[PDB]
Amino acid sequence: MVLEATVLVIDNSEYSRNGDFPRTRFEAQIDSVEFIFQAKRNSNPENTVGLISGAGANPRVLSTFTAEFGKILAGLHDTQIEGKLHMATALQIAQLTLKHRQNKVQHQRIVAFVCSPISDSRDELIRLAKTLKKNNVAVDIINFGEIEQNTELLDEFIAAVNNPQEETSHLLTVTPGPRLLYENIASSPIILEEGSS
Amino acid sequence: IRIFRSELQRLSHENNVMLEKIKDNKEKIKNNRQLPYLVANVVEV
Amino acid sequence: MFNNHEIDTILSTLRMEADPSLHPLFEQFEKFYEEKLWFQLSESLTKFFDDAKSTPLRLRLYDNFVSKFYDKINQLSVVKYLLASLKDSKDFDESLKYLDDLKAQFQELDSKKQRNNGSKDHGDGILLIDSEIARTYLLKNDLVKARDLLDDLEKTLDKKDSIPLRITNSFYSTNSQYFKFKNDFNSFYYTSLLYLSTLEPSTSITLAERQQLAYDLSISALLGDKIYNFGELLHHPIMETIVNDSNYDWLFQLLNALTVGDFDKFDSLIKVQISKIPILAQHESFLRQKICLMTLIETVFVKNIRMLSFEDISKATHLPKDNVEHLVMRAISLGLLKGSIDQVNELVTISWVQPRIISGDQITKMKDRLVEWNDQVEKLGKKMEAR
Amino acid sequence: HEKVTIAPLVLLSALDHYERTQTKENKRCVGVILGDANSSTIRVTNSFALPFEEDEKNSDVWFLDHNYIENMNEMCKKINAKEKLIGWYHSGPKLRASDLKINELFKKYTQNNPLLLIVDVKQQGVGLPTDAYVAIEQEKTFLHLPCTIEAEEAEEI
Amino acid sequence: TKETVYISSIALLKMLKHGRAGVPMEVMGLMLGEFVDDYTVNVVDVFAMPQSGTGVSVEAVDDVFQAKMMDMLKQTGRDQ
């Protein structure tokens, strides 16, 4: 039903200084990889899940698209929880990752964990908006932060990157406290449902 | 039933990492050994 | 304006849900001083941008809250501030009483939070204990017992790998403290430059601490000539970052005193403690000649002729003619310079030395020599190429 | 210090990577080398290439995949067991943010210090198009090491 | 008609170095290139191949390790 590639982006900022929301934080994103990989690769073929980091310690590629979720779990290790944030770097790392992959000429999706409003440059996000539209790239923004962070340059990125209907962005707000991270992502359009074209 | 299943999945997956690692090693260790073994005697260890 | 009493109390309730597992005495010490303006270890958030030199009564309070400090703000508050910031309190009643909080307590945190490399950035779990190992004997008795513990920190420096350079320089600050109260400041001047010399990103301190850092650099270059001269700190952001009064001009005074040759100008700006040692006047005359020694490569003569007489160094160093022969013997014997002198024609031809980073007329004469190398390309080179 | 001995096959094949794809100045190729780094004389008996992508206008944009190295190392285990990763090489004289950061990724599979090699694709001037450098800190300081060309008996003939 | 193989100086040296060590020891390698039947023949890149228990054979070629090298050799043009 849905054939797409998933790219997990790890972005941190000064708003990420909280390390435990209910009993933990940033440790739930490790276990959520198993639920995302099982609901995509094991559910239907031609669905691959990669991992990159555009902020925190170093803006590098943690793990590329593989056939198992264990290699993605090794990429999440050795990652600074509090560090610098670069928005324009994470978008270019995924574009180079999605350029070389298996089963080309398909739909592409980027799943980014956004803990901060990400205020850097307005014109830089506009020039990078039309770049991802030509390759049919779907950038999904998940908000954690402190309660809800919106009505800023973060939401301006969603409206500026959308020429089509389902191929660009989906908003998901995670409520702090004892909440299931994989359940809010599964019920969201991020996993299967809409976005396929 | 709750915490044990979280750590069991990590050890079970790591056991599969060495499983695929030895799977190619089992094929090499058996094939690299020459089946027509020749009689020999070691004079000094 | 109260950062700890008001800003720290309000923001502590909003961060980490409701409170970071605060104790009923958290608001007790805040209302203790009231308007007395005693911050006393502002405890993480406020403490980052706010410093407290007062003697804290909460030293043993937040030690159990370290588990909540990581999930609230950062884990660097323990290594940068709090138990490691005790040196700013300047309380003599804590001597050798910090082994529980600053030594034994870190061992309990090493078995829970940071086991090896820790979390977030690196460097945590190393500077914690290693900073207070040498500081044990830096107070109380003589520094002799502290030197035996300095080698243990140098062994861990090569084994451990830390991204920030402040941990490596922190081990050099303890080595420099050993030579601060001891003579032969040449070794003290070498260890002082290791802490901060040219490094921009490391050794981040306030403006008031830059003057005290240059104070140790002012007394280090007095009794020894090693590693260039007072002119080396001029290029580095040290001399230009301090004030020219309050006996901080000792670097500036002796810089121009080499060409002038007047000891009474520097003697009037100092005290009797450092002016009663003849070594100060003995090694100062070397830098007066060392400036002339730098002229033996390319300065005046463009023929590459190295010549230095006794008359040029006699008026510059304020020394008589009979002591010129005895001055050269003391320089080679102490390892200051190498070479030989001519006692017949009264000439000096030296050996390998340490030329400074100076420029202008120096680089102007060195580039003109390379032109002579290039002019010989048009002279000897064109003849051999055609033949 | 240490020494670096590079076989003539590595320096000959590294320059060929530039002409085949007609790479412009906006892209710079990166590759890996093999040998024994345990001794004081670094010997390079093998070399490979990597699908490295880089942006010229942005020094913060680079792409390097370590999974291709894992599948390649498993192939060498059935060929030569004495070949391990001693470092990596890149193309172009310029050292930018993309070139200095990727040196740490190869330190995971390399026990000793990865050898740094700056390949000149235009071979302009003097000899030795690829200089051998070592990474050491007191800020990363790259020091020049003596470069010698020595090969085996069958390779030189 | 018979082909005339033109081997580049780079590929000729690699094939000699891979099959170098030892008299009894046998190895195997793969040759790459792009040429057309009758003339135009050439050899671009060559690299060693993993050896099975039978030594030189058809089943000793591993397409798993070979497919990973295709994306690696494509960046520098070595893929053929």
Curated annotation (Swiss-Prot), chain A:
Keywords: Proteasome, Ubl conjugation. It comes from the Eukaryota. GO terms for cellular component: cytosol; nucleus; proteasome complex; proteasome regulatory particle, base subcomplex. One of its GO terms (molecular function) is polyubiquitin modification-dependent protein binding. One of its GO terms (biological process) is ubiquitin-dependent protein catabolic process. Disruption phenotype: Cells are viable. Residues 5-190 form the VWFA domain. Ubiquitinated, leading to its degradation. Ubiquitination is promoted by HUL5. Belongs to the proteasome subunit S5A family. Multiubiquitin binding protein. The 26S proteasome is composed of a core protease, known as the 20S proteasome, capped at one or both ends by the 19S regulatory complex (RC). The RC is composed of at least 18 different subunits in two subcomplexes, the base and the lid, which form the portions proximal and distal to the 20S proteolytic core, respectively. Present with 17200 molecules/cell in log phase SD medium. This is 26S proteasome regulatory subunit RPN10. It comes from Saccharomyces cerevisiae (strain ATCC 204508 / S288c). The lineage of its organism: Eukaryota, Fungi, Dikarya, Ascomycota, Saccharomycotina. The gene is RPN10.
Curated annotation (Swiss-Prot), chain C:
PROSITE patterns: PCI (PS50250). Pfam families: PCI, PSD13_N, Rpn9_C. It comes from the Eukaryota. Keywords: Proteasome. SMART domains: PINT. GO terms for molecular function: structural molecule activity. SUPFAM superfamilies: Winged helix' DNA-binding domain. Residues 187-355 form the PCI domain. One of its GO terms (cellular component) is proteasome storage granule. InterPro entries: PCI_dom, PSD13_N, PSMD13, Rpn9_C, WH_DNA-bd_sf. GO terms for biological process: proteasome assembly; proteasome-mediated ubiquitin-dependent protein catabolic process; ubiquitin-dependent protein catabolic process. Acts as a regulatory subunit of the 26S proteasome which is involved in the ATP-dependent degradation of ubiquitinated proteins. Belongs to the proteasome subunit S11 family. Present with 12400 molecules/cell in log phase SD medium. This is 26S proteasome regulatory subunit RPN9. The lineage of its organism: Eukaryota, Fungi, Dikarya, Ascomycota, Saccharomycotina.
From Swiss-Prot, chain D:
N-acetylated by NAT1. GO terms for biological process: proteasome-mediated ubiquitin-dependent protein catabolic process; ubiquitin-dependent protein catabolic process. Residues 4-138 form the MPN domain. GO terms for cellular component: proteasome complex; proteasome regulatory particle, lid subcomplex; proteasome storage granule. One of its GO terms (molecular function) is metallopeptidase activity. Keywords: Acetylation, Phosphoprotein, Proteasome. Belongs to the peptidase M67A family. Acts as a regulatory subunit of the 26S proteasome which is involved in the ATP-dependent degradation of ubiquitinated proteins. Present with 19800 molecules/cell in log phase SD medium. This is 26S proteasome regulatory subunit RPN8. It comes from Saccharomyces cerevisiae (strain ATCC 204508 / S288c). The gene is RPN8. The chain holds residues 5 to 169 of 338 of the full protein.
From Swiss-Prot, chain E:
N-acetylated by NAT3. Present with 16400 molecules/cell in log phase SD medium. The JAMM motif is required for the deubiquitination and degradation of ubiquitinated substrates. Component of the lid subcomplex of the 19S proteasome regulatory particle complex (also named PA700 complex). The 26S proteasome consists of a 20S proteasome core and two 19S regulatory subunits. Interacts directly with RPN8 and STS1. Belongs to the peptidase M67A family. Component of the lid subcomplex of the 26S proteasome, a multiprotein complex involved in the ATP-dependent degradation of ubiquitinated proteins. RPN11 is the only catalytically active member of the lid and serves as the essential deubiquitinase of the proteasome. This is Ubiquitin carboxyl-terminal hydrolase RPN11. It comes from Saccharomyces cerevisiae (strain ATCC 204508 / S288c). The gene is RPN11. The chain holds residues 23 to 102 of 306 of the full protein.
